Amino acid sequence: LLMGVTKSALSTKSWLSAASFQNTTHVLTEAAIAGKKDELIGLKENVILGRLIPAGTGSDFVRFTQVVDQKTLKAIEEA
């Protein structure tokens, strides 16, 4: 199928972004009827929730990196 940008955006899985976009009453009533769960995949939902967006330094690929010097690493190795 092919749909314009507005209709493609309004058909997303996340009810938070769709509700904050346009046609708020329709999105909200459909989501409430369906009992939809928002998994917080995109950026707007995380911004609305005041969380760390899954991009840049907030990406799971990089945000768990640790840093340590050689002296402490050697001490842990002896331990």
């Binding site: 950026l43 911004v47 005041g50 969380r51 760390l52 967006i53 991009a55 840049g56 330094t57 907030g58």
Partner: peptide, 14 residues
Amino acid sequence: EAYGAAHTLQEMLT
């Protein structure tokens, strides 16, 4: 968001 500055945005928004 386009800069990928997640922590700056989180500090500013809360």
